[PDB]
Amino acid sequence: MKKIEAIIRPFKLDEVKIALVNAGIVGMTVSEVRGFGRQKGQTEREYTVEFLQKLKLEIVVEDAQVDTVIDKIVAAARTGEIGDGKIFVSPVDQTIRIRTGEKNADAISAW
Amino acid sequence: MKKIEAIIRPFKLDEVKIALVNAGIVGMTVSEVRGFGRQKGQTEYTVEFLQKLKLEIVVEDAQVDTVIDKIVAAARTGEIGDGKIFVSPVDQTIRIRTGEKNADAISAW
Amino acid sequence: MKKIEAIIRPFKLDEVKIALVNAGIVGMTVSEVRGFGRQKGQTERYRGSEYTVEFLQKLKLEIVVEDAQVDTVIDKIVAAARTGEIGDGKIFVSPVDQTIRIRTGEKNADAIS
Numbered sequence: 139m140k141k142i143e144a145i146i147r148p149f150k151l152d153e154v155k156i157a158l159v160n161a162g163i164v165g166m167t168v169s170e171v172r173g174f175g176r177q178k179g180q181t182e183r184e185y186t187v188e189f190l191q192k193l194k195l196e197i198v199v200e201d202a203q204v205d206t207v208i209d210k211i212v213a214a215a216r217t218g219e220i221g222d223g224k225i226f227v228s229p230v231d232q233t234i235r236i237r238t239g240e241k242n243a244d245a246i247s248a249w
Numbered sequence: 250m251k252k253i254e255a256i257i258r259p260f261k262l263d264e265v266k267i268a269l270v271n272a273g274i275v276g277m278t279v280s281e282v283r284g285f286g287r288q289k290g291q292t293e294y295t296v297e298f299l300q301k302l303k304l305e306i307v308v309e310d311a312q313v314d315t316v317i318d319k320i321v322a323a324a325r326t327g328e329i330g331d332g333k334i335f336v337s338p339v340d341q342t343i344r345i346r347t348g349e350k351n352a353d354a355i356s357a358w
Numbered sequence: 359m360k361k362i363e364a365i366i367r368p369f370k371l372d373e374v375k376i377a378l379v380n381a382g383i384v385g386m387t388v389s390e391v392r393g394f395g396r397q398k399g400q401t402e403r404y405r406g407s408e409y410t411v412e413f414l415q416k417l418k419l420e421i422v423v424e425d426a427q428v429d430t431v432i433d434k435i436v437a438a439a440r441t442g443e444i445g446d447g448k449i450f451v452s453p454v455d456q457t458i459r460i461r462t463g464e465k466n467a468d469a470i471s
């Protein structure tokens with residue numbers, strides 16, 4: 139199992155959501171964050187570093203779904219301009235659905 | 250050492266907090282997030298985000314089952330949307346005031 | 359690659375930022391959180407209050423770096439964030455398998471540099 143955390147431009151949330159869902163993702167968590175990358179929050183063209191509003195998407199999936207999730211995030215979030223965002227993939231040891239106590243694959247599965 | 254991330258309904262925070270603390274688990278970070286699961290945010294083909302809280306609790310391996318047990322007991326109810334728990338590895342923990350590491354940065358006293 | 363997740367006092371963000379960027383660590387994500395540590399949100403602790411718990415506002419900083427930069431990052435956060443009082447903060451380091459820059463599709467080292 140892996141957690142895929144992607145930080146993207148806020149306006150791109152709707153496209154990303156639809157792309158992931160059409161590819162069979164059935165679970166995701168979003169929050170609002172502030173960040174900067176290489177360009178220190180500057181869109182123009184003095185080292186005054188600024189934060190911009192971004193959305194952080196977190197999606198837990200089995201290993202065989204990882205490439206698909208990354209493909210759809212990249213296709214939905216990209217515009218070609220600096221600040222398009224970053225994706226981080228990390229291990230998940232165990233997943234549990236609280237209502238039923240199901241584990242791992244079963245806790246990750248559809249309706 | 251492991252991180253336990255639980256996404257629960259916001260109004261269950263107080264029960265979870267009490268369940269965990271009575272069992273000796275004393276350190277937690279909480280954040281407001283929005284989410285959906287396999288019902289795609291429906292309480293009744295649209296997809297909606299609902300308000301949840303994310304709890305993050307870092308503990309020693311020996312305490313993981315305890316943390317899961319208490320979060321489940323406090324937050325399970327029987328209605329869809331009760332939440333989901335993710336367990337991941339932590340390689341190092343450091344207490345900023347002291348520079349204490351690992352087991353020492355995670356326990357009391 | 360590791361993710362460094364540092365929970366600190368909100369007023370220490372600026373100093374932590376400057377110290378990271380001056381050290382060539384350029385890229386971070388910040389968010390507002392609430393928490394307690396072993397003092398359970400209490401700076402005044404009373405008989406029986408061990409089982410009461412208050413949440414305080416903190417800031418969570420998340421910084422993904424290469425393995426070789428982890429000590430530098432911890433050092434800089436600890437020096438900028440430390441006040442000497444309970445509640446100064448706590449840092450969690452965890453593995454990251456992959457990092458990808460969305461704009462270019464570049465990966466790992468090149469997506470952190």
Ligand SMILES: Nc1ncnc2c1ncn2[C@@H]1O[C@H](COP(=O)(O)OP(=O)(O)OP(=O)(O)O)[C@@H](O)[C@H]1O
Nearest residue numbers: 173174175176220221222223385386387421422461
């Ligand atoms: N190393 C990092 N650690 C944690 N968060 C990061 C890191 N790098 C970027 N971010 C987060 O990702 C958001 C988007 O970063 P961004 O797309 O600017 O990356 P970049 O490497 O500068 O690529 P680009 O040259 O395309 O702008 C940032 O504003 C910040 O929230």
Ligand SMILES: Nc1ncnc2c1ncn2[C@@H]1O[C@H](COP(=O)(O)OP(=O)(O)OP(=O)(O)O)[C@@H](O)[C@H]1O
Nearest residue numbers: 165166197198237256284285286287329330331332
């Ligand atoms: N695979 C996942 N990745 C990331 N977040 C998820 C995932 N599954 C669920 N979540 C998050 O956890 C919250 C609670 O999920 P939920 O309790 O609805 O799980 P479920 O699998 O749909 O089970 P139930 O049938 O009991 O509702 C979601 O709103 C979302 O924030």
Ligand SMILES: Nc1ncnc2c1ncn2[C@@H]1O[C@H](COP(=O)(O)OP(=O)(O)OP(=O)(O)O)[C@@H](O)[C@H]1O
Nearest residue numbers: 276277278306307346393394395396444445446447
């Ligand atoms: N084990 C933990 N898991 C998750 N979050 C924690 C943990 N311990 C601390 N935190 C987060 O870190 C913040 C600051 O912790 P703090 O510095 O109070 O830790 P401490 O162990 O109590 O040390 P001090 O004795 O220096 O207070 C907390 O408010 C909470 O957000």
Ligand SMILES: O=C(O)CCC(=O)C(=O)O
Nearest residue numbers: 175176177178179220221
């Ligand atoms: O995030 C943006 O829109 C531009 C700023 C940027 O790319 C950065 O700070 O790395």
Ligand SMILES: O=C(O)CCC(=O)C(=O)O
Nearest residue numbers: 286287288289290329330
């Ligand atoms: O989270 C809820 O309150 C109900 C909707 C749901 O369970 C879901 O989206 O998976």
Ligand SMILES: O=C(O)CCC(=O)C(=O)O
Nearest residue numbers: 394395396397398399445
């Ligand atoms: O966070 C503070 O400033 C004091 C309370 C504390 O240290 C804690 O809850 O562990």
Ligand SMILES: [Mg+2]
Nearest residue numbers: 175176177221
């Ligand atoms: Mg950038």
Ligand SMILES: [Mg+2]
Nearest residue numbers: 286287288330
């Ligand atoms: Mg559900």
Ligand SMILES: [Mg+2]
Nearest residue numbers: 395396397445
């Ligand atoms: Mg404390």
